[PDB]
Design a protein around this ligand. Structure first.
Ligand SMILES: [Mg+2]
Ligand SMILES: [Mg+2]
Ligand SMILES: [Mg+2]
Ligand SMILES: [Mg+2]
Ligand SMILES: [Mg+2]
Ligand SMILES: [Mg+2]
Ligand SMILES: [Mg+2]
Ligand SMILES: [Mg+2]
Ligand SMILES: [Mg+2]
Ligand SMILES: [Mg+2]
Ligand SMILES: [Mg+2]
Ligand SMILES: [Mg+2]
Ligand SMILES: [Mg+2]
Ligand SMILES: [Mg+2]
Ligand SMILES: [Mg+2]
Ligand SMILES: [Mg+2]
Ligand SMILES: [Mg+2]
Ligand SMILES: [Mg+2]
Ligand SMILES: [Mg+2]
Ligand SMILES: [Mg+2]
Ligand SMILES: [Mg+2]
Ligand SMILES: [Mg+2]
Ligand SMILES: [Mg+2]
Ligand SMILES: [Mg+2]
Ligand SMILES: [Mg+2]
Ligand SMILES: [Mg+2]
Ligand SMILES: [Mg+2]
Ligand SMILES: [Mg+2]
Ligand SMILES: [Mg+2]
Ligand SMILES: [Mg+2]
Ligand SMILES: [Mg+2]
Ligand SMILES: [Mg+2]
Ligand SMILES: [Mg+2]
Ligand SMILES: [Mg+2]
Ligand SMILES: [Mg+2]
Ligand SMILES: [Mg+2]
Ligand SMILES: [Mg+2]
Ligand SMILES: [Mg+2]
Ligand SMILES: [Mg+2]
Ligand SMILES: [Mg+2]
Ligand SMILES: [Mg+2]
Ligand SMILES: [Mg+2]
Ligand SMILES: [Mg+2]
Ligand SMILES: [Mg+2]
Ligand SMILES: [Mg+2]
Ligand SMILES: [Mg+2]
Ligand SMILES: [Mg+2]
Ligand SMILES: [Mg+2]
Ligand SMILES: [Mg+2]
Ligand SMILES: [Mg+2]
Ligand SMILES: [Mg+2]
Ligand SMILES: [Mg+2]
Ligand SMILES: [Mg+2]
Ligand SMILES: [Mg+2]
Ligand SMILES: [Mg+2]
Ligand SMILES: [Mg+2]
Ligand SMILES: [Mg+2]
Ligand SMILES: [Mg+2]
Lengths: 191, 106
RNA sequence: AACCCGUCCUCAGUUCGGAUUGCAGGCUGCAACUCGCCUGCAUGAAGCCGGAAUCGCUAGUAAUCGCCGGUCAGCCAUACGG
RNA sequence: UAUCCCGCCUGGGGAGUACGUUCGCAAGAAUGAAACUCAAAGGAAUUGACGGGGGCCCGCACAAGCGGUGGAGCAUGUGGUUU
RNA sequence: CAGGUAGACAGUUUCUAUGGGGCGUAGGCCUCCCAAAAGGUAACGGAGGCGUGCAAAGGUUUCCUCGGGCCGGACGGAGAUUGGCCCUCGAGUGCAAAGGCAGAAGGGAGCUUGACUGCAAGACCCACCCGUCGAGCAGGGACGAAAGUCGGCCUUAGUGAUCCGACGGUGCCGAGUGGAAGGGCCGUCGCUCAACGGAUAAAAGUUACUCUAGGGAUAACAGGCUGAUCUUCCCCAAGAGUUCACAUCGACGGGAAGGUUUGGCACCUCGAUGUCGGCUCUUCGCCACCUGGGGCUGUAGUAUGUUCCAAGGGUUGGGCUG
RNA sequence: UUACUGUUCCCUGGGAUUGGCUU
RNA sequence: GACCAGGCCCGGGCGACUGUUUACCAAAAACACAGGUCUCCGCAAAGUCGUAAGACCAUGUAUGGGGGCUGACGCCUGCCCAGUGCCGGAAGGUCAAGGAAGUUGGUGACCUGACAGGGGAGCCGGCGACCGAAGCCCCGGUGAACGGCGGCCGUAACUAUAACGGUCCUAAGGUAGCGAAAUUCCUUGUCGGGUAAGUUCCGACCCGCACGAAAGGCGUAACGAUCUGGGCACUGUC
RNA sequence: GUGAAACUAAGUGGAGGUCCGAACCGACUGAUGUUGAAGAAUCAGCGGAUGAGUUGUGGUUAGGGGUGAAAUGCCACUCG
């Protein structure tokens, strides 16, 4: 178990972690944005498509999305024939909003935050954080096995594993703090 | 795999998201008997609504010529474009499976 | 016209094959560059009967040879109808 | 055609399901709902269509024969791209 | 009698170095540095290599010079091969490195086997055993016209004592004598005996059921040294702060004290310095949580914020956890 | 204990105990 | 009315239970247990103790005896025989002592040469064609025998998951049931319940570091000077 | 009660590795003692107590061993 072997076995296993930790933190942030806590919605209306002369086309190409207020939204359709198609898609999408019409445009109104919704919604926010922590702990759980597999194969010493393992926890614990930090700023958004 | 494809904008323009949806469906139904066929013919159409009088309806005509004197004719009509593509692909997978059951009758 | 008689070419990308391009000319037409048809020369590609597949034909038919006409000033007709 | 007695049905799905009860070593049997939901479900028979059902017959339908296409070059049409 | 066959049973082995031991790594030889201008010189100090190869890459005689850059020339281009010019040892010398070598120790050609036999004055090295160079003499020879050169390779790693055995040779001995068996002698061969001065022809683990002889020469607790780390301050002020570096934070970096953290060293204690937390009972320190008294404020007031003097006194009861 | 060298139980062959007629 | 003379209830883990155990720090979840299963033994039995004679087993006879594992009862007890074991097989290959077709050497009655060469008989030796068992190799069976029971990618119409599929490697890749457990490192996992507040306790989820089917799995009334949490009553524990 | 049985109500009977609890055999908790009264006991409660029970007398098994409801426990205060 020369030093050149410890560096290589450290470099191989460690890069699989860091390259895997960044995948989790990237996807975990996407799980928060999918909760859609009625802050602002230039993004919600993007995935809804509509039919325009036998062509499924996104709403972004057919009309403009302007946010005059955080709790509302304005759609300026260039074609009046395409206005009704937008109303159909929003309702069939079942997002949870009742669109209105003023004869020219479509206006949305995100509802207010209720107490019953905030608690049921807060349970989802905590649940996603739990799914993030277990994702990290599985990576700590996978990395330490490989150090033990090298040990049983007599390519590392007992002394090397205790050093790498103790040094590997410091790496993961840094990424753990990123989980709470994203959770702290989110819990402030509930109010 | 290793099979060509032919689309046709009969009464409209063929988009890219649509073309991806076409390859996804027939790619499933044809991947099974992929070593029997060489090409895939497709013809999309649209009618009604704002274009013509009557209910909006979009046709998807799909023809297939295998490597051994096989001919398939499939035509369906639906209210949307993707729904029309879905129903036709189910018909091809039905008749395409009917052929192997006759060849593998023994 | 295929065909008959006679000379030459003897299995070669060849006296097979005639694409591509340059030069020099003619006819139609007010007009021929994009965008017509032809002549005279010189260049002389690919191509050695052709995968998986697939078409026509049961008698003067298939195969093969050439002729005519319509539209048309002219003609991209190797088409169409005989 | 008639009399006497027993059991059994009252649209379909949910469902012979759930709770509870009796029996059974168990597997399970018997008894047996409701919420919600559709305007049908179903029977006989006819007519066509269809059948890797049966029987018969026909067309260059296959088979057999002759010559081609698909390859090469060049006419000429369609798509596609481009404008 | 022989072959095979159960740790059922017996007798034993199971290396050392080591900033405690173990897991790891290493064990012999050569080269450079550390090595302090002779030589020699340690560390778990920094870099790399060897366990050979060549029948010519040996010996002798003899003729040559590589490499780089530019220019010219078909395929040919940065680069094959060819001509010329310029700088001159920048190449190469089977392999690591150092040192050395230019009409050469490098690169070719011709003949050859001295990659001999029997020696050897005198030296270098040095605990011992080993190891290294070598004028010169005889013999019989190679190359060269001759003088002269040659006892393997430009040099330094390419290796293993002794016992025993094996092959070949031999004018030696031959257990009464003659022979023979066998042995000696000469020439040479056979170990990754690599833990490489090799304990045997032949050997791994476990003990928390344990035991003895010893050690503070040697670990864990504590003390002490050190102060990386930790804690607490200071220096510079790029900026934040509506403008305004210093009301309050202060990056980038720098200079300190303290000895409560985790550690390094292993100096006291191994014919004993009994541990974590808690109960009870103290007592000091200030780098100040509250109480007393002040300054500044982006201090209106109340209430803070930061900081100075100040350690007199005070600093609760419970749930979970050893 | 699949550490080294051995012992024992056990299995197997030759010999003794051990002989006759046939194939 | 003194002395004498049960505290009780709800829930969970382990073991079925009565019992046995480290005399002098461990009474238990360990041991035993009824039962269940595998394998051996046809009596001059296997097995066990002995140098042997012989003894026990047994004055018994496969509904009996010995040995291994498991441990009432109830529902069940899966996959892999490549390897290691055990059983059986017998074609060939390897093969001891021993036997002996022969071959070879030493000695020398003699012969010859010029001290040496050759050499009969007899004696003493060496080598060994071929014959030569079991065992092993080899061919099958056997898991309530020792034992083991995998990874990497992609895919569902919002994300997220992956019913499904592809690939590599093994003898085979963990089936029922259970699951932060007497097993879970991260860990005081997370949600719920209980408490004014619960690193312990109960229920559930499953990311099972490293459950798992007779070294048995999941449950289980009763029992326990067993471990573990809560509550009523009681009290100088406080 | 039935065709006869199965099944079923009383009485008799007094079973159990049954219950409470002395002797007897054990030794779970705590206190005390810990140069003890005692080289394991005293005090207060505790377990089994018709059974796989306890006990006397007289005997058997002896160390590369014996014995062991198996702790490496016991074999004359001594047992890897
Ligand atoms: Mg050609
Ligand atoms: Mg030809
Ligand atoms: Mg052709
Ligand atoms: Mg006809
Ligand atoms: Mg009918
Ligand atoms: Mg035909
Ligand atoms: Mg032993
Ligand atoms: Mg042995
Ligand atoms: Mg001894
Ligand atoms: Mg040592
Ligand atoms: Mg000096
Ligand atoms: Mg020196
Ligand atoms: Mg040089
Ligand atoms: Mg030279
Ligand atoms: Mg003699
Ligand atoms: Mg000599
Ligand atoms: Mg040595
Ligand atoms: Mg223990
Ligand atoms: Mg023990
Ligand atoms: Mg000391
Ligand atoms: Mg310490
Ligand atoms: Mg210390
Ligand atoms: Mg101190
Ligand atoms: Mg210290
Ligand atoms: Mg003393
Ligand atoms: Mg002060
Ligand atoms: Mg009492
Ligand atoms: Mg627990
Ligand atoms: Mg018990
Ligand atoms: Mg008991
Ligand atoms: Mg005791
Ligand atoms: Mg007890
Ligand atoms: Mg006790
Ligand atoms: Mg016990
Ligand atoms: Mg016997
Ligand atoms: Mg057990
Ligand atoms: Mg086997
Ligand atoms: Mg087998
Ligand atoms: Mg399962
Ligand atoms: Mg927990
Ligand atoms: Mg576990
Ligand atoms: Mg508690
Ligand atoms: Mg639990
Ligand atoms: Mg287990
Ligand atoms: Mg099993
Ligand atoms: Mg098992
Ligand atoms: Mg069990
Ligand atoms: Mg108990
Ligand atoms: Mg009793
Ligand atoms: Mg009692
Ligand atoms: Mg006792
Ligand atoms: Mg008492
Ligand atoms: Mg009592
Ligand atoms: Mg009692
Ligand atoms: Mg009792
Ligand atoms: Mg005695
Ligand atoms: Mg003795
Ligand atoms: Mg004793």
């Amino acid at each position: 178990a020369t030093m050149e072997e410890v560096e290589a076995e450290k470099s191989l296993i460690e890069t699989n972690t860091k390259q895997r930790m960044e995948k989790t933190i990237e996807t975990i942030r996407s799980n928060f944005n999918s909760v859609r806590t009625n802050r602002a919605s230039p993004t919600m209306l993007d995935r809804i498509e509509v039919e325009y002369y036998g062509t499924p086309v996104s709403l972004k190409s057919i009309a403009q999305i302007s946010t005059p207020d955080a709790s509302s939204l304005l759609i300026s359709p260039y074609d009046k024939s395409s206005l009704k198609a937008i109303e159909k898609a929003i309702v069939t999408s079942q997002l949870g909003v009742s669109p209105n019409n003023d004869g020219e445009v479509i206006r949305l109104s995100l509802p207010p935050l209720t107490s019953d919704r905030r608690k049921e919604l807060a349970k989802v926010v905590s649940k996603l954080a739990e799914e993030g922590k277990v994702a990290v702990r599985n990576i700590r759980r996978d990395a330490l096995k490989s150090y033990e597999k090298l040990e049983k194969e007599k390519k590392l010493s007992e002394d090397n594993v205790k050093d790498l393992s103790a040094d590997l926890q410091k790496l993961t614990d840094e990424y753990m703090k990123k989980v709470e930090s994203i959770y702290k700023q989110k819990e402030q958004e509930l109010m | 795999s290793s099979v060509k494809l032919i689309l046709q904008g009969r009464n409209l323009e063929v988009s890219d998201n649509v073309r991806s949806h076409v390859e996804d469906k027939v790619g499933k139904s044809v991947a099974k008997h992929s070593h029997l066929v060489r090409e895939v013919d497709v013809r999309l159409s649209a009618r009604g609504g704002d274009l013509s009088k009557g209910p909006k309806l979009r046709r998807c005509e799909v023809t297939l010529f295998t490597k051994r004197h096989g001919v398939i004719r499939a035509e369906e009509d639906a209210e949307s474009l993707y729904s029309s593509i879905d129903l036709v692909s189910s018909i091809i997978q039905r008749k395409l499976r009917k052929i192997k059951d006759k060849v593998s009758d023994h």
